[PDB]
């Protein structure tokens, strides 16, 4: 602390007034970093307020100055401006008043729909739940996609990474998961309701506006909170936005309800955090990232948990998004998030342009919850599907130069081709779990071997309609039983053969 | 003495003392703090200022806050009172079962046992895993490393080793959860309770758990491995027991040291790491050893970043282990579980004079067929299977039978797959692979060798396939 | 999308020789001819 005014008043023995323990003055300001002299009673990661009305967070506490990141444009901050302590660390509004609202990283509404009447505020940096308060992940979290709910299942309380290149369908997976919860939120079952939270980090405001337009048209906005820290916002806002959205989802998790968080995308939050660390003169590491960039994502995603029945039983499900560069998952940030999350959904550009949409690489996509994240009917049909897809994987290569094949092998090749075309699905149309089970069950029991793969989608709509208004007793029978009995299997096969004769 | 906080930058806190300075590795406690934040002295900066790393979150720290020197390093409770309990990095009970009432405390920093105290006993530890027992057999009292990337099966393998060894071991066991998922720690804690290894009523608990997970700061994740090691060292030394030390994951000890090393004023090393990587790993690993007083059988899961075994953290760990089992993604993608690479996993007791001549010759014979299989695959790609001659036909056919037979269903993975778990004696493993090498089962299909424990189940599965088809 | 055999070691499907580790289409050719022979045998 040796500046010319402070040095000179130390020579005179003036003992100056305006004591700098709850206040301070800016020494240097630039690139969103303000070095402030004073603020002696300040706390680490504490909010401050500048004389221009802007807010800031004190990250570096040093004997001479305080390193403060600026929540906005630093053109308003000037050298010698008065910085005041807020007195508390960063907190955001929480509650159900934020459902249907678009907010920034600090909780201020940006959709122009008026003030938010929230009653409670939680600090964004709470500690994750421990070993005791959480229970094993057991409830299915329905994405609505056949390739996800069967092969890479997601349970309530699980971090599942959606990783891929640019324009591979990562946002498509996340938005369709939010849209799929319309069925459960309309129903009377309070246990199966899911309140989604979408966090947009570093995107365009027109991209976020297109997201809100899609969610409002599908009426998914009533249970969705959109936290938006776009590219025009400051790097501290984009860094703070996943923790703000996590705190909003932690309100539902701690109150017995089930919430879903999408961080779209965490690769941009690392870029924002790298910019703050470099401009705070902290020494960089791999790809100029700070050392604590792993702890950045680990302390965020660990707060996604399935609480025990003594803590209300609520869950917090996280779907982080990571963008790779030409499929390089050996980079610093994709490697960290893969090692943190409970599973991955790899999306490949080669599969995307081969017609496979969603472009999920089944050989690279894992899920550490396994069959416990699936319902009983889905577990019965996805296990048989995983065996048949494994058998198809052994025999799918024969189309390269093979010409004569065994009759059983040809049946395996034909059924697996039907299954690969079964896993394809259009965008913005998530299907219910009963429809996914029924279509997959027909695919793995040979009910589609006589159908050309080009008409699989037409069969998927029309046959499901036929067993909906006419054979709804069978659907009630499966729902009450919870699985597929041999008698129900024979009944469904007879309806399939009757429908194929009429087809 | 008493000090005051000078700087707070990340997980690194600089504190200044007026009286005599605390030594390096001493434990400092922040006074105006509710969850008992503890700082560990890392270096003396001069001008009566020491630089520390925090064992908990640093939010809300104020420059000028009083810090108290405990006069000693981090001391944790040790003894039988830690059995069936969960401890954090600083020894506080995090299982919500009240305080750990005990009379014995041990510092988590200690010198490694000397060269005079080293034991050269090497006897094979039978695990029931066919690829482990045959190709890279574990030794009692030796160090075991489970190398692998993300999702290859290190956690499932270390859960299977706990099920097969620690349930009927005889003597205490210690699990150290270092920088992993809290869900996995909750899953293991309830699996131990259901298995009876943890008793919530009686004093018959066998395993002591120490957990510092991904949500912990880098200071806690870089010292929680020393906390679990201190519990294992007390059981080895002050009780003479045989100790099982399961660590998952030991890479997080290295990674958490690299996160704070930039803020400690260090130039980065190659790839990007602390310059003290080999020394910090060496001081930690050489405490985990079999003394002449007692034996510690250590099984450590080792994360391989981006499946690059030439990364400095897995590469330095190789020299510290008697047996290394490398889990490969290529093996796992074929459906083979466990995904142990047969041509990348080594053991020190893989000797004719330790495991016998028949065990050694079959293991070397298996590795020779699998190596010739990799060499022949390029000819198969170009020339095709039509032009290979009957010798290479039998090499490829027996290699696929061997490669399928290395897979095995795990009891801890039964909920994942549905296959019942199977435990295979070492004698049945040697006999089973000898039959495939001799060519006694050349008429069997290769699907009969997939996910079956003994070779008698291979014959039964082949008969079932033939009868059904 | 299933990680076809011979597409690459660690790339979804593969494991074996240099061609199978490299993946692409020659690893697919190696897996195709090998699996065709052993399916003919069974």
């Amino acid at each position: 602390a040796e500046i010319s005014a402070v040095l000179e008043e130390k020579i005179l023995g003036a003992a100056p007034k305006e004591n700098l323990e709850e206040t301070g003055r800016v020494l240097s300001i630039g690139d969103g970093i303000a070095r402030v002299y004073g603020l002696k009673n300040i706390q680490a990661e504490e909010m401050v307020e500048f004389s221009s009305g802007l807010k800031g967070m004190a990250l570096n506490l040093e004997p001479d100055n305080v390193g403060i990141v600026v929540f906005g444009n630093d053109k308003h901050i000037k050298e010698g401006d008065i910085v005041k302590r807020t007195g508390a660390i960063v907190d955001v509004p929480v509650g159900e008043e934020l459902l249907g609202r678009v907010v920034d990283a600090l909780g201020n509404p940006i959709d122009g729909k008026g003030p938010i009447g929230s009653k409670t505020r939680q600090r964004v940096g709470v500690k994750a739940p421990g070993i005791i308060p959480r229970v094993s992940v057991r409830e299915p979290m329905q994405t609505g996609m056949k390739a996800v709910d069967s092969l890479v299942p997601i349970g309530r309380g699980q971090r599942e990474l959606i990783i891929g290149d640019r324009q591979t369908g990562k946002t498509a997976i996340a938005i369709d998961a939010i849209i799929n919860q319309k069925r459960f939120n309309d129903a009377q079952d309070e246990k199966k309701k899911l309140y989604c939270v979408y966090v947009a980090i570093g995107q365009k405001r027109s991209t976020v506006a297109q997201i809100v337009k899609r969610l409002t048209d599908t009426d998914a906005m009533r249970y969705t909170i959109v936290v938006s820290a776009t590219a025009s916002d400051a790097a501290p806002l984009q860094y703070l936005a996943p923790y703000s959205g996590c705190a909003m989802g932690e309100f539902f998790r701690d109150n017995g309800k089930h919430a879903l968080i999408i961080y779209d995308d965490l690769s941009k939050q690392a870029v924002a955090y790298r910019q703050m660390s470099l401009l705070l003169r902290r020494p960089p590491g791999r790809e100029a990232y700070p050392g604590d960039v792993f702890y950045l994502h680990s302390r965020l995603l660990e707060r996604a948990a399935k609480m025990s029945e003594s803590n209300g039983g609520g869950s917090l499900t996280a779907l982080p998004v990571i963008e790779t560069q030409a499929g390089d998952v050996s980079a610093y940030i994709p490697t960290n998030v893969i090692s943190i999350t409970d599973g991955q959904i790899f999306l490949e550009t080669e599969l995307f342009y081969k017609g496979i949409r969603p472009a999920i690489n089944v050989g690279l996509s894992v899920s550490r919850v396994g069959s416990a994240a699936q319902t009983r009917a889905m577990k019965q049909v996805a296990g048989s599907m995983k065996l048949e897809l494994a058998q198809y994987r052994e025999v799918a290569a024969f189309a390269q130069f093979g010409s004569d094949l065994d009759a059983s092998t040809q049946q395996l090749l034909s059924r697996g081709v039907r299954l690969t075309e079964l896993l394809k699905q259009g965008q913005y149309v998530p299907m219910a779990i009963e429809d996914q089970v029924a279509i997959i069950y027909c695919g793995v029991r040979g009910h589609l071997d006589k159908v050309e793969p080009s008409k699989i989608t037409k069969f998927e709509k029309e046959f499901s309609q036929h067993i909906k208004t006419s054979h709804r007793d069978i659907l009630d029978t499966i729902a009450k039983e919870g699985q597929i009995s041999p008698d129900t299997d024979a009944k469904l096969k007879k309806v399939v053969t009757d429908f194929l004769s009429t087809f | 003495s008493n000090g005051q906080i000078t700087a707070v930058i990340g997980a690194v806190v600089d504190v200044q003392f007026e009286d005599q300075l605390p030594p390096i590795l001493n434990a400092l406690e922040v006074q105006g703090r509710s969850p008992r934040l503890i700082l560990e002295v890392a270096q003396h900066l001069g001008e009566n200022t020491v630089r520390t790393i925090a064992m908990d979150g640093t939010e809300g720290l104020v420059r000028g806050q009083n810090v108290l020197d405990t006069g000693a390093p981090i001391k944790i409770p040790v003894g039988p009172e830690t059995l069936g309990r969960i401890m954090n990095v600083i020894g506080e009970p995090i299982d919500e079962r009240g305080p750990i009432v005990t009379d014995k405390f041990a510092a988590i920093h200690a010198d490694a046992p000397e060269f005079v105290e080293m034991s050269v006993q090497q006897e094979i530890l039978v695990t029931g895993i066919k690829v482990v027992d045959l190709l890279a057999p574990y030794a009692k009292g030796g160090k075991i490393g489970l190398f692998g990337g993300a999702g290859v099966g290190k956690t499932v393998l270390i859960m299977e080793l706990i099920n097969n060894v620690a349930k009927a071991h005889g003597g205490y066991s210690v699990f150290a959860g270092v920088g992993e998922r809290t869900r996995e720690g909750n899953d293991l804690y309830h699996e131990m309770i259901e298995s009876g290894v943890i008793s919530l009523k009686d004093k018959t608990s066998k395993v002591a758990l120490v957990y510092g997970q991904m949500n912990e700061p880098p200071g806690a994740r870089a010292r929680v491995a020393l906390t679990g090691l201190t519990v294992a060292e007390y059981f080895r030394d002050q009780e003479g027991q045989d100790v099982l030390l399961f660590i998952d994951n030991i890479f997080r000890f290295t990674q958490a040291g690299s996160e704070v090393s930039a803020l400690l004023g260090r130039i980065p090393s190659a790839v990007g790491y602390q310059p003290t990587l080999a020394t910090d790993m060496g001081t930690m690993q050489e405490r985990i050893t079999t003394t002449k007083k007692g034996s510690i059988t250590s099984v450590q899961a080792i994360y391989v970043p981006a499946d690059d075994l030439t990364d400095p953290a897995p590469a330095t760990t190789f020299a510290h282990l008697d047996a290394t089992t490398v889990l490969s993604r290529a093996i796992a993608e074929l459906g083979i579980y466990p995904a142990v690479d047969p041509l990348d996993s080594t053991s020190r007791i893989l000797d004719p004079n330790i495991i016998g001549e028949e065990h050694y010759n079959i293991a070397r014979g298996v590795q020779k067929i699998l190596q010739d299989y990799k060499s022949l695959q390029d000819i198969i790609a170009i020339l095709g299977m039509d032009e290979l001659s009957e010798e290479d036909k039998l090499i490829v056919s027996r290699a696929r039978k061997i490669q399928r037979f290395l897979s095995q269903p795990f009891q801890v993975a039964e909920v994942f797959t549905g296959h019942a778990g199977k435990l295979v004696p070492i004698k049945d493993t040697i006999k089973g692979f000898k039959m495939i090498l001799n060519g006694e089962l050349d008429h069997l299909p290769e699907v009969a060798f997939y996910m079956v424990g003994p070779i008698e189940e291979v014959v039964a599965k082949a008969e079932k396939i033939a009868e059904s088809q | 999308q299933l990680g076809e055999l011979g597409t690459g070691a660690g790339k979804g499907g593969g494991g074996g020789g240099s061609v199978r580790a490299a993946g692409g289409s020659f690893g697919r050719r190696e897996a195709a001819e090998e699996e065709r022979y052993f399916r003919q045998k069974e």
Partner: peptide, 26 residues
Amino acid sequence: TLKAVSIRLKSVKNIQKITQSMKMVS
């Protein structure tokens, strides 16, 4: 990456050796 190119270069080198050997025989 560097490892991917090294693996691919090793495979193509083995392909050339086999085809050169096949060319001499044929």
